[model samples]
Target: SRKTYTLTDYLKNTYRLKLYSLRWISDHEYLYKQENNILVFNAEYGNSSVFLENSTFDEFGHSINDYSISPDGQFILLEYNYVKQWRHSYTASYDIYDLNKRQLITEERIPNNTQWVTWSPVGHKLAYVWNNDIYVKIEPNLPSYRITWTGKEDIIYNGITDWVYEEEVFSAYSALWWSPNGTFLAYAQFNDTEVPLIEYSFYSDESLQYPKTVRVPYPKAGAVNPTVKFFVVNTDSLSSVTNATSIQITAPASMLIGDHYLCDVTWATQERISLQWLRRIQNYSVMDICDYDESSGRWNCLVARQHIEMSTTGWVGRFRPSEPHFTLDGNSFYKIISNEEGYRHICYFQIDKKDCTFITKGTWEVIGIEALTSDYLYYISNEYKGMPGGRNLYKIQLSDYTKVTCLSCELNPERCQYYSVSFSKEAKYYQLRCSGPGLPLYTLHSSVNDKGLRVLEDNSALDKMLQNVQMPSKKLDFIILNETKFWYQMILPPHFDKSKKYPLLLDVYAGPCSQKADTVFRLNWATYLASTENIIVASFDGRGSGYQGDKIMHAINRRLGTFEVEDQIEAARQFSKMGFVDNKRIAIWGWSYGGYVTSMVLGSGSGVFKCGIAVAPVSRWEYYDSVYTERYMGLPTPEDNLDHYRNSTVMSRAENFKQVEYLLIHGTADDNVHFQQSAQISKALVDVGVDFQAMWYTDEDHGIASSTAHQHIYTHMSHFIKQCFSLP
Candidate 1:
């Protein structure tokens, strides 16, 4: 039989087969799930066991979409019937099983429309949200108590966040935090009574005649935002205390003087809590340490505190304010901040003194703190400084602060250019997932030894299948502008040559704290463009791009469309300067913020780009969410830097697009960016009598995620781009 390996076959067979998930139980033990079976792997013994068989799961009516074991390993919480409500909000039915006894305890015990169910880290106690209220259960079969009574259907949400908070503020569905001893519960209370509702038609496959309407409380920029508050409950005294409903945690006079959002919350101790508050515009963030005063029976904000002020040219952090990782003693914490050289470095903060000291300093950025131990701080960073987009794990001695050792730099460096790690509780063992420059590999590594104990996933089948397929090569390098290096990555066509001219396409998504030039493996349209279409696809992280440092990343602060847009135009011009590029056929394209930048660049009157595509782009700051838009552009009021907001709009420069071929695309149901962004752009073009092409994906969200629809849109884009280049 004649054999063929097409893209369709590769996508359906090879790509789908390698997808799996893992959960760590201990330093040497981890559980990997496949379909309905859960297999526990022991790295020390290199053996596996059927922790939960598919036959056992099959005996229950519901399939296991996901499962988690309790801290004591006595119970397993099974989650199924997931119905997504928003970006992070969802309703799911749960099942509890006695793992030690190998029997099902109860199924669907949580209500039908439960928003979230979480287990306490210290015990088997569970807390869940039902109908915007919070409920807690001491044990699986024990009686549950409704700790909140003020929550209403659509106006108030306790323990669970509303749409804006879920998507923009906390970036989580649940706004609850549990203490180490499991005695106290801290949850956020959101009041959306005054927030405006956004309604859209939900066209179901079964009912097309009369579509159901979906309404959500969405706060646009400068709108009436949700009033957020936090409360603490004594779980141990809930049933016995006379006034055990909810105790409101007071906001500081400084925080109350202005519009603020509850950014982060954590339990510092049984009697102490740490709360983080950010200005609505995100210019200032304050961390308050509060103690539960037994005499007053309330939490009082302590005098010792830490506050972060925004950079003169950028936002507060690389992205959202990174949460502080606390020491086991709860006396100190570690955070990542920018050094004098503009790279993110680790800094230590003491809670008692409200002071911080630098732990690591260099020109390379520390991506994140992976795990912390009493003796060492383990993290991932671009410490292989010259490698541009490469990442590796490293551990630094807390005692010396100068002693550092690379963990993943030499471990198969040829294949593992990008690495991610998950450590078991005390950093005794870690699962290193190598995903770059080559086929992905996964292994269990012991902290004490350099050798890997067991192979988790080698992607052998994908590697074998790739041998029969033609793939494009990637060139990761930097472009210098005024003695500063800006990183870029390009996917080169197969059998590339510098003498032959190729149509250049700039794939851009230059947003704040965003990185696209990374050593992560991908098999997407850029690869297709170069390998199958002979187009040079490149991505450059210009000003406002993340991971390098605050200086470069925040260059466009208070001016979203200024340097970011200019940098893309400059990148296109630089690309056209190359001998292998056809300057007459240069084009740019992007989605979301990338889409916004693409529009801004195309409308810059820059002669470098002949054509461009903008999908679901924000036309103006006023039309976007306050938290994200205001972070960069402040408020739309004249007193609060309104000129920047006015100048940054794509509509303001719509007339400049008369010289370029423009294609505008958006989804009608894009809840995140909203279709109004593209609609406004189209209206602006029409009002100016500028000719352009436009397309809309009906009822599709920001991602335009439907398989058939996405395939059609990409095909349309491919044909459009090909015709612009006069390709066969």
Candidate 2:
């Protein structure tokens, strides 16, 4: 008997697809965990051997969270008792195990609650952050030497990113970088002494009489931002008396003229490094290529080694300036930058030159620089079929400048259009992960001939299970708006009939540089809504969406919550006029930025949507972080963009909510978008005499990702949506 995919199956781990999660230890070998046991596989022969058994740590008394193998494969660093702090920051206890000796180092263990840790590039030398300070251990079990002593909690961070940098700038918890030969350690120091703190009450368990107030050093829009400084220390010069003497590498004169951020730090070679700095406005940035001067024991950026990137129409390179991909000798590099037509493409540059040559060009944009070798440079792009929603990998010749090859476009052209790739250390082998209109497929390939080595994971088990279930269908199409093609995707009901008018749901996350409509396949609440409830869930990538070009992406640059809001209402109207959609039963929902768009669209009184839900949404620009909000909307001051900031708030539109059913939800402990934003919206709705449903998750952060809370919220929203649609 055939069955339908249920919400329970989606919530519980019923049809969870398997993935070949691996780390390439060498050019020809990789390690993957299977059933908690580590296995090593050779790329050439596809042969596997057990590296470590699952029961090896049975008597360790602590549940293992994760593990990292040293580059030399002589030792293993085991992480346990992992405690997450923010989105990208966490603290964990670590123990080093000598792989060659088959014993754990009991003496001089890594202190508990180490903030962040990583091994050096060439050896087992470990660098870690503890108590917000940097420490380096040349030998695994040896005493670690302190590199800095100026670390202060919530004030001065030596080698770890703070809240803003962890979320916005670096997208990582680490601010440290090691030279290629493990000789010098370069890191950024962030001072957040003046950044304002966001204080909120957290209702923890049921026993406490008073709630705990969580305080985070969060900089709101137009608030005092964090300051950063860069330094480099020679690891070989460390001593027990004091510590390694670090040399300060000041930013260029242009960046020092005002407040700036040390956004990127990439080592060009063992003797040269690259630093990228972006001003507060974010439209202008500079890259400084500095070299180690052996005579003076300092790093110097020559006059000719400075490169500038500016955008008059919008912000530079997506969020920040694209990093340089240097060759072996560090004489040249390749980077993705916006061309004159506002299309992102690959540009080849000399180390000391100001002008660059475009290596790739089109209306489509290159997504990222994946890997580079002596002869070829690999990248991902949306250049295939001119479909901005799809991604494919390609390689271009460094010398010819004309010989380019599409690596993954023809692998399974019908089933796979969106591909993500991982290359080995030396670029000899690569893995292509296809997640798309069909079941996800992962495969390994050799770079020499671009031949498929083996099928790493085909998800054949999931496919067999799916054979007996009634699955939903996906439709990838487009709509014309002002002579521009806007992409959209719809999850159609099982056994769909166009002659039957079906209810529609507009799922959106129309933020700056966001793409909601893509070819990636998924089985979630939307699948259950379409498969079991026969609802057509759709997502539109209209104005402010990414990948098509900056023209469509930057349409609502300083004027957010305007075109993006109107575009959703317009997309809903177009969907209603499609002859098969029920105009009176359409609803919308989103989370985070998506949540803001949902609230804006529903509050517009367009009458196209019957109901909408916003989770952890930003109601006003001032409530969000500076790096993200100010990047699109400049400073909230009167001289910059205060008027638009006041005009685009979701709270100001509360009077129009009478026309739609609105459900407002937020986590009480949300650090990204505070609960105050939603509270203000609710207060505004009350002031306007409008009735709406609201829910609050206790002690939950922005994700609300706790097990019970996740299940409960989805179930609640499921019922709300069904009631709005008059469905059983």
Candidate 3:
């Protein structure tokens, strides 16, 4: 029982790679794999390939920076930017090439830089937003069309969104959406006239060898947001492109009740469109919906919209209830995911009543809904619902939520079963894949066996490969947070003994996206730390962590450094209160937003953690992209929140190093949180004369996955965690 598993083992065991992110792509009949550097696609839409022969590699000091797949997968969009500017995404040269001919379609020598680019849904043409203006390629022709000509530093933008909306609202590549027919393009225009223009100084060699000022329009909490206007662009600008109606949303009034972000827009009918948006202030939230009618040419606010304010607890936002899906008769519609009964459930709705009835119910959250056949839904749900940290797979019939059955049934409690579902348009046979910890992914091809599932391609390859490797070690224990029992997993040393006090390594992700404390899929970090290096690895969810209900979930509120980080501190404190934990050698480590929270906890002077390793942390909310930051913290505040920023920022407390050993890592080319975070903190350490270590992934991005042989980086992380923490 003393022998434990690592984080890598859990990931290697339970987590299945969802290669494709789009639902439509996942629904298609295809086989895709990356050979060499090229992505080979085998789909029904006719075989096509995008060769990476000309891609500029960041590994060998190459020129190319990034590339993407075209909407139809007929072309490859390539970009090359060679500047360590304030914003890594600020770019210069970009080209689109025809996959068929392997020749350039349009090689535009971008003068300034392009922020984003995306192709039309139908074909041929693509749209890009740069310099706050919208540009479109004239379809089969190579010429680019300038949609919004009124782009200015002060005036903000026209066809494209500003910084905040682009970050939080549209998480997509571009703020533009192409119609199903590609005849029209819908985009957002951000009028950031009222947003405060702030400037910071950074040294630029070409600019007089002194600190150069970089100016940006940033709106803090309780600040004015640029008015957002929905616009429709015509491919053929010969006619008035403004034939469509515009829905303008402003602030403080009818637009954004408090401070909010627009989420999605769908054409309910040819002449009607529906929009979903959310508003938030501290722990309070609301999701609103509305319809823009082309027949009456007026905007109709949906009565079902959040008329009342949500409690200072829990998260409640406008749920789309579904994607752009139609009924069998094309008269009614269905929403993909709705959270009405306090849980996200599939639903069916009428476009008129706007009321939806749950189709798939029960305590488990549906991970993926493949297809709905009559009263049956071929999908995947959590196996351990109302349980701890496992998100496994299952299926059910909506007539009664309890009618659900396991698709990948197994008796192994240590292994985790992750699921993915796909059904042909016929909705007859369905495909599901399930696997447990250390077990290879097994695909099960089943019919309406919502009750008794059957297997198809049991992933003999992964099973065979798994049998060849050594299994990691792990142990699961429950920790109490807010009087609720939550699971926490840990890996002990291979040479461990109950007589020794061991250092604790806390590997965490406190965001809504993931939870590390679970039994379904054990983590390999623990095993790697303990077995190879004799360290102890632990992970737990604190207050303000996700999946739990509203009451305890809103623990963080706007106080970033308070709740969740405090829980981590409490975890350490509780462990110290125990007889086995060596609090003097405890270390905390995380990435992205996780890194931010780690910084706050260590820098808080609470002695929660002895050392900290933060990878690509948002030093201050204002330093981050708009969409995610504003959603949680509202706009950037001009008030005393500066001290809050100071409190939350680790760089602000570099002088408080004391017994804390800091190891900071960042990708110099990171576009999300920017490499400036580490650099800023390093400078602070220098100013405070605090000894620390730092690593910069020269050409890596946010996830650091973009880097070649990212395993080396992960190994570096493992080594750092081991060196900083002491175990049995």
Candidate 4:
């Protein structure tokens, strides 16, 4: 009865992992910080040096939160006063240190609370956003030149995304891109003049007498979304000539016919760029390839290079259109698209050609196109044994598409089934981040051959430490549902005996294109539950889950919260029949979309679950943002999916709560799934005279992932779960 993986251990990070957080600076070199000092290591040869010692900044005064090295390695920029504004947005102050001069640039420093900043792709030229406006500095120690003069708070956002776009569309704070050769700075300007703002109150510390109301420009379903315009300015020709010339690139005519969003932007070469535009309905999209014409002194959209992608069954490209990875000359590119068989695979396209040749095709899908080289193309796929939950790296020779090699499948075949890959500049080297079916392992490799150069991290110490602990074992298998293979995973308790019945907790996150059952290892609260409380933590990937194909991924299209909900209940029923589960003590819980599904399952009146908890759940589809909601549910109007939207709300089934004990948790400052969602659910339960437990995190956001608050909520849920299970 030595210390099991207790709640305290999970909260306090007693089981820490040795992870290599290295950034590749070149094809043969990478940088990582250790002991408060920055070290640069050569990937080919195992030699490292302290690039920047911590002792050098003893008297610099401000604590450096992070640092960024210029592409040319001439100067280093230090980030401080880093403040997180939203999920993908942050503001910080930066200072540039000249490595050549051996002195910090004291003049023209990056101002405090700057919105965003970055170095040019190939040089030390700086471009930043301050006070919602874009600025550029040709020299690190020189004054910044204003690129855009029109920038207003909460209305016109220049070089950065608004609330909705930041959360759903780009998933990044800044909307600026530097050209390959650092000649052009392409940026998007968003005008949120017609978008509605979501207002919420943030309860700060006890010192504040009045709470602050945070208003964000958020576009819900059927609302007027933000209008965007793209521009490309020559950063190499900057001056204080009163006005800077920026060439505006308009959206494709098909997209501009109605409300559309500029989703993807990729620079093919220094003078060539590609843009993908999506209609507000998200069913149709167009990729417009543009070239800078010196004859007209402007950017020209080529009619010959225009391509279109549409989804008759559901939304396109999983979340958005797949961006093309251009070849060295920018004449040809490779992208992942759904084949005629509905399986996503890589396709090679000539810029001016309408038809694309399929490079990789099969019943199984290619996850992504990783890197493109002159002779070979690398990608990740689940083609080995048709196990969609697994991932492996593969390289296909361009000279012979049939000549493909699985680079990672045979490397410790049993331990390294799932791999995450990262390639250095020019694709000469790569790092394989393998997780699952075993302890996580990391290794660096070179392209000369598929030989591993070094073991970045193998989790050997973690393995040694865990040997003393009675940790849980995982089982990854599938169940036949609807004449198809639906995978499910479980974290069995230590020393598991199938003959002995145990309480089960169904961890549900059955969302569109979400794969909860994966070949990846995690040491989270679920592990603690299985190890200490002996509770079976299981998750099912049924309809609407991804990786199997479009048929499975599009099952819940135009119907946000229907079959995904029922599949979970059926999975619970199947798990109960396994004879190892105690049917009386079955429970379920989820967060976000997972939370929504959990609430739906608990309120299904199935008489299956004894109790369940829902955290930050979306009660209705209309409450989410336009980009994500419209992708699956079409629109909130009656002409499209209004009827299904009406039927898919969690509040409508409030009367069913009496059958099972339920607890609801929400963060008041949840920006993605608004707090209004949970409020409506609680009000609906109240209308039905149903009693339930509720907890609110005062100022916590969508994740509820603050320091003490995260531990507190998990501890609270742990108590509720234990009480429901009749465990002491």
Tens digits of per-residue lDDT for model 4, 1-728: 45578888789988777777889898888898877889998888879999988787788899988889999999999899988889989988888888888789999888788999989989888999988899999989888889998999999999999998888889899999999888899999999998999999988899999999999989988888999999999987778866778999998888779999999999998899999999998888999899999788799897678888888888999878887899989998999998888889999899887899998888899888898889899999999878898999999999999999999998987887899898988888999999877899989999878888989889998888888788998899999889888999999999899999999999988889999898888889999999999999999999999988999999899987888898999899999999999999999999999999999998889999999999999998888888899999988878888998889999999999978899999999887788999999999999999999999998999989898899999999999999999987
List, residue by residue over 367-422, the lDDT tens digit for candidate 2: 99999999899999999998999999999998887899999999999889999999
Worst 10 residues of 4 by lDDT: 1-10
**Global lDDT of model 2:** 0.92
Steric clash pairs (candidate 1): none
Candidate 4 off by > 4 Å = none
- TM-score comparison, 1 vs 2, better candidate: 2
TM-score of 2: 0.99
**Positional deviation of 371 in candidate 2, in angstroms?**
1.1
Q: Could you tell me every candidate's TM-score relative to the true structure?
A: 0.95, 0.99, 0.72, 0.99
Which candidate wins on lDDT?
2
Tell me the lDDT of model 3 at 599: 76
Candidate 3 on 167-206: residue-level lDDT in tens? 5555443567676566566677767777775554544345
Candidate 2: which stretches are off by over 4 Å? Answer: none
lDDT of 2 at 579: 93
Lowest summed lDDT window (length 10), candidate 2: 1-10
Give each model's whole-structure lDDT.
0.81, 0.92, 0.58, 0.90
* Clash totals in order: 0, 0, 35, 0
How many clashes does the backbone of model 4 have?
0
- Ranking under lDDT, best-scoring first? 2, 4, 1, 3
